């Protein structure tokens, strides 16, 4: 009788998404699955029992579940348990990036840069990058008061030159959360840069 759960022991979901926690057992004839949190609160997600196999499907993810979610197997009168921490993120959008107008060598020119719907934010790094040279880098430290999606956002002006023609704007958002590969800590944005003279 032997207990196995996917992943092997941490999921990071991203909030929105349709994720499944499955548990199984080997060596037992008919077990019994029962699924529970640490703290024995809803598991907001569907269990579905088939054969030796149990199912816990979110659907969608929220912020209703971050926790550490246990399985317990039962197989005639021994049990067995196997947890599955899982963590919330939200990343769903590339960065857009905002023009105050046409590029003019000569005049200055306005640049937003915002990523929408974000968390943790307080994990996210924004940088703005011309060619392969960084002008403005932007972290949000300021610790979150609470669980929620927010929009946030690098602004920076410079004065293009007509040696920028050519030269590609890259807006790059970083999350710092434990990295599951499978799940990117980078997204950007690029533009390529016209510049026009001004007669």
């Not at 499955?22 to 699924?35: L, Q, R």
Request: charged share 25%.
């Amino acid at each position: 009788f032997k207990i196995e759960t996917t992943p092997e022991s941490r999921y990071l979901a991203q909030i929105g998404d349709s994720v499944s926690l499955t548990c199984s057992t080997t060596g037992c004839e008919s077990p019994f699955f029962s699924w529970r949190t640490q703290i024995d609160s809803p598991l907001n997600g569907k269990v579905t029992n088939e054969g030796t196999t149990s199912t816990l499907t979110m659907n969608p993810v929220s912020f209703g579940n971050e926790h550490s979610y246990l399985c317990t197997a039962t197989c005639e009168s021994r049990k067995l348990e196997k947890g599955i921490q899982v963590e919330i993120y939200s990343f769903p959008k590339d960065p857009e990036i905002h023009l105050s107008g046409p590029l003019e060598a000569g005049k200055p020119i306005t640049v937003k840069c915002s990523v929408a719907d974000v968390y943790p934010f307080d994990r996210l790094e924004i940088d703005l990058l011309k060619g392969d040279h960084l002008m403005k880098s932007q972290e949000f430290l300021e610790d979150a008061d609470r669980k929620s999606l927010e929009t946030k956002s690098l602004e920076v002006t410079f004065t293009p030159v007509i040696e920028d023609i050519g030269k590609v704007l890259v807006c790059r958002a970083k999350l710092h959360i434990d990295e599951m590969d499978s799940v990117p800590t980078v997204r950007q944005a690029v533009k390529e840069l016209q510049v026009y003279i001004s007669p």
